[PDB]
Amino acid sequence: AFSAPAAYLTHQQKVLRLYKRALRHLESWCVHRDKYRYFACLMRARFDEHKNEKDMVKATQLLRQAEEEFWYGQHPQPYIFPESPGGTSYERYECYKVPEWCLDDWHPSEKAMYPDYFAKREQWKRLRRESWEREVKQLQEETPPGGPRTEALPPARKEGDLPPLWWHIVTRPRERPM
Amino acid sequence: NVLQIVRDHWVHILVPVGFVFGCYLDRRSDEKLTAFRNKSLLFKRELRPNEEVTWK
Amino acid sequence: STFVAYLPDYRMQEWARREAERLVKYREANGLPLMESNCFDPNKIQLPEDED
């Protein structure tokens, strides 16, 4: 969610992702801890049995067969962490998330409460206004002529710079806003 | 000082005056359809010792 | 809303209910049928002479 994706996944990445998926589904099948540990050690042995195959074609064939076996033997109802995309609390608190710009529309009577908070907010807004043009200039310099090729962004490099395009990442609402 | 107030808010009598004039014209229209007043078989009635017409 | 709620009964619902009450009382007292299938008296109707 945080890292910029690459153009493709490598063979090692696919093997590791299959290993994690297989272990998770095996834990879903093996509810008890000791049984899961036993069969997970067996699965790890089965995985590292073919770790030293120098023929890449045979390696991809083995990966293909393993993925077919996984799809046949997957748990139809695997365990999902409650806040994971399939969980029971996945987007539960999205209705409580309010963007910060709404605070600009508060009536002055509402802003009369919380004076110090709004003074700090004004300081942050001043910082963003002072940093924007330098961020844009740094992005203009660091970008190759044929446009960017990845979604990775550079850090700040100068004396008192800020990493470009930082406002909406830094001022995230919260994970439990209200 | 009522001069400025009148010249600013004299448009507020047009609609009430129109309502009154419409009521008057409706009464005038009713005045022209009395050919069967106190003459229907259902409502024909003897006049009271004082009243002249059954309705206006 | 108050003006509409207190509008006088020009639809004659209560009048019709009272008239029906009187009619039912009279007809049940004298043993007549409550309602007749004919709403017009046949003696005031002249049917065509021949049906053949």
Partner: protein
């Protein structure tokens, strides 16, 4: 610790609701009081036979005082 909770401005909706309640009540509390006072101290008419030779006014054919008025 106590944290600031970011919400949209609730001032304007509350103001509208208060204004609507105020005006509705401003005209509807006198109406309710008047209806109650009329009902208590000027009841409904009692149905009676028409006396011989009397021609009632049209508003005399209804029973509630407000409807008659």
């Amino acid at each position: 610790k106590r944290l600031f909770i970011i919400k949209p401005s609730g001032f304007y909706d509350r103001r509208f609701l208060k204004l609507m309640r105020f005006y509705i009540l401003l005209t509807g509390i006198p109406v309710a009081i008047g209806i109650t006072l009329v009902n208590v101290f000027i009841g409904e008419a009692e149905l009676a036979d028409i006396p011989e030779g009397y021609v009632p006014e049209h508003w005399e054919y209804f029973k509630h005082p407000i409807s008659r008025w």
